[PDB]
Structure formats: structure tokens, C-alpha cells
Design a binder for this molecule. Structure first.
Ligand SMILES: *[C@@H]1O[C@H](CO)[C@@H](O)[C@H](O)[C@H]1NC(C)=O
Lengths: 161, 56, 53
């Protein structure tokens, strides 16, 4: 019924000790490497991945849809090069959502010229609620959240008309 | 009312998919049988109505 | 690792063993704490033995 794409974590202020310039070849725009616009790939800056801690309190009088992801490097060498730690975690804590994600490093079949997948998770935040993101690696952090008010529960149509 | 009769289930929720399919097929069966029988019976009633008008 | 090439769906079964006492685990697998990681493109789980009488 009303959809608003807004900044939940502005890249300028939010992450001071992380490069947040990571790009991917599979996500290619005009021949240059690129990445998603609503998510930012975090990476260690100056050779370290400091313990992350972020909080967002909802005050939009609306439900807020938040997307994020967890990165699984293909080999242990990729994890060492990127996040500088063999074992990491991602804790997402809400009033009604709570999960811990652990990277699973494994050699996987090549799709889109990549060897290690990343998983995408989402959550809905109620008005007056707070969501906390913590990690020390493998976090594909949110950039833009989506404040929405649900309407008549419709569906989708696959068509070429 | 406003409804969307299409649902999507993954590969670990086939009991739900078959329950939804059973609901859809049962509704289709009920509506088809009722509509066909209703049309037949009302056609008979309408022809009898015209016959009664002529006889009256 | 097993790569599917049968042009068909492949059903795979496995199991995880929980010894009753810590002595059984020590005798069998020689390690107090173990794990079982099953990783697929759409399936991913880690299992940890739970030892209990
Ligand atoms: C960055 O590191 C400094 C200390 O070097 C610390 O005070 C600050 O909180 C860190 N920022 C984040 C976002 O972790």
C-alpha cells in the first residue's frame, strides 16, 4: 500500500574501519565489475576486520523489510585473504528474530564464474522495534531498507503480455 | 471477494502443495458439477415455462 | 563429494550417531566432540552429537 526505499545504513558514515568497495565480476554493469545496490559487501580495511556492531530502531510507523547476506568463500584461502579469520559469525538479533550464521567453506560447482555462494536472508521489523547486526566476517550488510505497508494479499503473474 | 488462487511452495513442502491442489481441485469439481446440473435443470424449467405460457 | 549426472533427482540418506555415554564415543570415534557437515546448493546443515543416557 505504500513503499519507500530508504537508507538504513549510509555507506559514508556507518562503516569507518571497512573498505566497503568490494565488487563482483558476475554482477557486471557496462563491462565493469559491480555489486548489488541495496547491499554492500564488507571487507577488512588496513588488513583487519574489526568486530562489527550496528543497531537500527524502527520509527517509521510502518513495517521495515531488511535484507542482508552471508558470504561463504570457496576455499579457506579466500576467507583468509578477505576476512583474515578462519572462523567467523553473523548474529542478527531482533525482538522476534534471532539467528547466528557460520560460514561453510566448500568447493562448489561453478555458476556465473564463481566458486563460493552467498546466502540471502530477510526480516520484517515492527514499528518501535530494534534490529542488531553483529559480525566479524562474511557479512553482506544492508544499504537500503524498505518501509512498506502490506495491502490486499495478492500474488504474481508470469506472463509475456 | 479479492483472491489470488496461486501459491508457491519449495521442494520440502509438498504436503502443503498437495493440500492446496486438493482444495483447488475440489472447488473446481464442485463448481463444475453444480454449474452443469444447474444449467440443465434451468433449461428444462425455462422450456416448461414457455410451454405453460402457451397453454395458458 | 558426489555430483549428480543422472538427469534425475537423487534421494540420499544418511545418519548421525549419538553414543549413550562419553565412553562409547571415546571408544568409537576417539574424540569427545565431533561434527557432521552436509553441504548442498540448497541444503546445508551441521550436526553435533548429543550424548545422553
Ligand atoms: C573503528 O575502530 C575504532 C578504533 O580504531 C573504534 O573506536 C570504532 O568503534 C570502530 N568502528 C566500528 C564501526 O567498528
Amino acid at each position: 500500500s505504500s513503499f519507500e526505499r530508504f537508507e538504513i545504513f549510509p555507506k559514508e558514515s556507518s562503516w569507518p574501519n571497512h573498505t566497503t568497495t568490494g565488487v563482483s565480476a558476475s554482477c557486471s554493469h557496462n563491462g565493469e565489475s559491480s555489486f548489488y545496490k541495496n547491499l554492500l559487501w564488507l571487507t577488512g580495511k588496513n588488513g583487519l576486520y574489526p568486530n562489527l556492531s550496528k543497531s537500527y530502531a524502527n520509527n517509521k510507523e510502518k513495517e521495515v523489510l531488511v535484507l542482508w547476506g552471508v558470504h561463504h568463500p570457496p576455499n579457506i584461502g579466500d576467507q583468509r585473504a578477505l576476512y583474515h579469520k578462519e572462523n567467523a559469525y553473523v548474529s542478527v538479533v531482533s525482538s522476534h528474530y534471532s539467528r547466528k550464521f557460520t560460514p561453510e567453506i566448500a568447493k562448489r560447482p561453478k555458476v556465473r564464474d564463481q566458486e563460493g555462494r552467498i546466502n540471502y536472508y530477510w526480516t520484517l521489523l515492527e514499528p518501535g522495534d530494534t534490529i542488531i547486526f553483529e559480525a566479524n566476517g562474511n557479512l553482506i550488510a544492508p544499504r537500503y531498507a524498505f518501509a512498506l505497508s502490506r495491502g490486499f494479499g495478492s500474488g504474481i503473474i508470469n506472463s509475456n503480455a | 471477494q479479492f483472491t489470488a488462487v496461486g501459491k508457491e511452495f519449495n521442494k520440502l513442502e509438498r504436503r502443503m502443495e498437495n493440500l492446496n491442489k486438493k482444495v483447488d481441485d475440489g472447488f473446481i469439481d464442485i463448481w463444475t458439477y453444480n454449474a452443469e446440473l444447474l444449467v440443465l435443470l434451468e433449461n428444462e424449467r425455462t422450456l416448461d415455462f414457455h410451454d405453460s405460457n402457451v397453454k395458458n
